[PDB]
Design an enzyme around this catalytic site. Structure first.
Site, mmCIF file in Angstrom:
data_model
loop_
_atom_site.group_PDB
_atom_site.id
_atom_site.type_symbol
_atom_site.label_atom_id
_atom_site.label_comp_id
_atom_site.label_asym_id
_atom_site.label_seq_id
_atom_site.Cartn_x
_atom_site.Cartn_y
_atom_site.Cartn_z
ATOM 1 N N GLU A 72 0.856 -1.186 0.000
ATOM 2 C CA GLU A 72 0.000 0.000 0.000
ATOM 3 C C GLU A 72 0.892 1.236 0.000
ATOM 4 O OE1 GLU A 72 -2.560 -0.914 3.525
ATOM 5 O OE2 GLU A 72 -4.173 -0.133 2.292
ATOM 6 N N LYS A 82 -11.430 4.711 2.637
ATOM 7 C CA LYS A 82 -10.575 4.086 1.647
ATOM 8 C C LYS A 82 -11.616 3.412 0.738
ATOM 9 C CE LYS A 82 -6.137 2.622 3.688
ATOM 10 N NZ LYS A 82 -5.425 1.410 4.193
#
Lengths: 121, 121, 121, 121, 121, 121, 121, 121
Positions: free
Chosen positions: D22, D100
């Site tokens: 990520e 997110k």
């Protein structure tokens, strides 16, 4: 020549329609105008005078859409195409799409309307 | 040959516009780029070197959109098409669409803009 | 008492803003008005005179939103709440939300704004 | 006191996340900030100095969202609430929501995230 | 012959991408498949055996999209077009569009991708 | 304490429903889960071990939504709330919303469903 | 007790409105119904007989929305709440929201309407 | 001649489908109809008698979509095109697109369907 100048989703509250009750209540009319214009000179020069200004086109569309009520979308679009073609020689052709998203039709749909394409003579 | 590589709805905050106040305040510019590229070699090989990488194209568009303010969308698109065509021989033709969803136009609409198509020489 | 009368997503092109360039160019202002009104009498009677007519409220909001430019959204909402509370005794409280979806803020967002709640004295 | 100042759908490309991959690739983070502020003085005065300017708040959120990568959304929101509460005494309380929309979760969903509410001491 | 059978917005969570981190984390891939098929026999007969069943096509797309990770969207689409063309003689041509709405590209956009068109030999 | 961890719009194709034909055909179920969790420790520490990981929660929801078909949305949500509350002591309360956007109801609507709130004992 | 059963965005073409022309032309009415019902028994049993069936509620709403034209949204909602409360003892309270997305109001907005909340006696 | 009359996103709840369970439960069918009609006479005259009235077309589509269940979308569209072409000589060609947004296909997608184009003989 595939260059175009466009104005999308212009919304106007008007009173057009073949039905008396429509003329009385009104409704929102959605308009899309696509103009076939050669944009390479403006692309080169960056001078606003070498292209067709969107702002002026919107004003034309608005004057027709928010003016006198007529029966047909076909007539409104004919008037718009004719207005744009008459005032801008650089416009080779005008496409006008008009949508009634909420006409007097008992049902469930996204919109109904017409689209015309008129070459500039 | 109808294969294409595309980048849709790229948004950049820029200061372009023929109006002083636009250059001062800025606004969001929406860009769509469609590239005519023969993708059968890459389809066969699966080797990234046989196609045009989207990431690099986005970087080019961004450098132009977020760079020096110019007057016209026509000039910005001309610069982008020319940038993509110059750096990638596999691109047979570049289509660039730029939309100002919130220009200084008193009204209700979805957006206004231009679209150009430039073949790679 | 949880009954309410509401007007959602009213859009007006105005010239409000603390920035000179905003006052010059303008932008779209989105307004939501929620009115705390006891609707059981009207629910019983079905007589339009027992409730607050949305159409009249929209006209009030519009006159303020499309009138003289002011600096703050806080002042515009204060004027609207005060206008609605003054003219309709049945309104126990007025909630006014105003959103600038495209303010002069270099970035990517959905909107910025304020919301006020004013009880009718 | 139910008045609020808000910033909705602020999007930032960042590198936060507990997963190495990520931190390497990044993703878009969506942020909503709602501030409890008494807006009646500003509503009266129309003087920008009597309220909290949205533009400054966005800048704060941005500096944190586009700065150093951290593991948690909880930590990012804690930093934002704390930043806003520290610099603006008129803010009685700060609500920070971070989403997110595309985390490393194999599935079909609209978004995942957290929301915190911190009173200004 | 302009008849078509289509499957729009098919979403699959996969691990394709030229980047190690992409292969590790994965992301959603959006796929549109348009098939050129003469539908007049089926239109006449109403017998499911005279057309290409969408359900079977979706299964094919899915097996490829949710199978082994590859580097390119070009290769995935090539495999899908080739799969559909091979198994259905009535399909005169297959169009496959694949969009990465959230690729590892630091920016704000709607999606990036490719589109191919393969005639059935 | 108003902090929450959330998972929005999780979609699963399942076979739940009181109708035989539903169990046979299936449909998409949309799920929203909101967890009341004190996030200040994690906000301070930035250590993933001080909060509830969304990824694990999604896995739980998925195992229940894509598992054995049951008659009611009420039973599915009861199972999810109970699953989350049992495995995470930090979750003070679990809210589960399940929506059938396309149930066997002859009509035009956005969705139907239920929402439950279960405190963690 | 925060459990609820809901029906969102139910759309019906009706002829309600205080204006003659509305009664003549009609328009789409959007309805949201939220029912306060204890769902723990059904959550335990999975027996459809322990809850309120959404399908039956939709039928009630529909019979009222597509029946005789009345002047007010307040009266329609009063009739719906009263219908649901009368027939289902398990419903502790009924919330009815009705929105006219396209009323006879010259302007640009998302919708106008009312919302009522009626406890079941 | 590029003029067209269109009806977009017409939604009907029907029972068509090759699967017994589909015929039993039903689902929403989305229909787009585009008619090639020369609109210059109507554009000139503004007389409703010189064009094809959308309202009548919607009624035709509806009678077919909400009538007897058939197996294929191909057959439904064939019937609609044939109905419109037969009754309106001014229609030079009829395009009918039918989409099943929620067919019995275990997956995540936007819709599946067919599109046909039939010239008026």
């Amino acid at each position: 020549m595939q260059d175009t100048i466009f104005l999308k989703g212009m919304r106007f509250y008007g009173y057009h329609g073949a039905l008396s009750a429509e003329n009385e209540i009104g409704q929102i009319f959605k308009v899309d105008v696509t103009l076939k214009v050669d944009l390479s000179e403006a692309g080169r020069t960056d001078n606003v005078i070498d292209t067709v200004h969107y702002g002026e086109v919107f004003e034309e569309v608005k004057s027709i859409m928010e003016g006198k009520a007529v029966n047909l979308l076909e007539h409104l679009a004919e008037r718009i195409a004719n207005r744009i073609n008459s005032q801008y020689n650089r416009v080779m052709e005008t496409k006008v799409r008009i949508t009634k998203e909420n006409p007097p039709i008992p049902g469930h749909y996204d919109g109904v309307g017409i689209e015309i394409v008129r070459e500039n003579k």
